[PDB]
Amino acid sequence: QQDYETAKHSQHQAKQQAFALVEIVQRRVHFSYSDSAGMLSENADLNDKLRQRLEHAESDRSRAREQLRQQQAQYSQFNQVLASLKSSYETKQDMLKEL
């Protein structure tokens, strides 16, 4: 029982640490707002900085788009090969039945 309460305390430590790390994972985008925080500090004409941030975001989004497209192609390739194996197994199994 003593070891079990100790293990429960250790599990609580792990839980809190993991929850904190997850929370920062969620706030991942917020760290990108460092530009937004710096931009907001302009307190004056700041449309050019907005446009620069928008261009950077466009570049990032295009990179992510290409990454997603190529990954989708790879996943589709894997899916066709899996389906081909499925059909081949069906045919071989049916022949084994018949033989």
Binding site: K8, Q11, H12, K15, Q16, F19, N43, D45, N47
Partner: protein, 148 residues
């Protein structure tokens, strides 16, 4: 001889199915390309409209004069007023509400972690139960958990 004839007929039917599905896939790919072009046209139009609105309003919104800035504070205060059940919520007394709601939030997180611990142990116990079930099924086949 008869067996090979049957398989040849099977192959003929499979070839017909392959032709049909190839035609269907070609039509689907043509439609997919058409919809890609249509979509890209829609984002092009949306971006053009956004840029044109930006250009038109360039002069309008530059001279904000930090005077229409405070309505944002008004909307934030009101949004908290409905979100936080505190119609008397004032920017003066909103700090006591801030600290009290932060205390509630941290208490909720602690209770959430407490529930999470027991949830994880229970789910893993069910996982071992399931593993026993799969081992039994593979060894013997279908059977209920009670018989396990």
């Amino acid at each position: 001889q008869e067996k090979i004839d049957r398989y040849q007929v099977d192959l003929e039917e499979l070839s017909y199915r392959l032709e049909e599905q190839t035609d269907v896939v070609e039509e689907a790919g043509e439609l997919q390309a058409e919809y890609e072009a249509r979509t890209e046209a829609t984002e092009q139009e949306v971006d053009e409209l956004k840029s044109q609105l930006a250009d038109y309003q360039q002069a309008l919104d530059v001279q904000q004069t930090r005077a229409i800035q405070y309505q944002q504070a008004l909307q934030a205060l009101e949004r908290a007023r409905e979100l936080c059940r505190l119609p008397d919520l004032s920017v003066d007394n909103a700090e006591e509400w801030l600290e009290t709601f932060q205390a509630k939030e941290q208490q909720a997180t602690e209770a959430l972690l407490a529930l999470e611990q027991k949830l994880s142990v229970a789910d893993a116990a069910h996982n071992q139960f399931e593993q026993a079930y799969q081992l039994v099924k593979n060894i013997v086949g279908e059977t209920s958990r009670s018989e396990a």
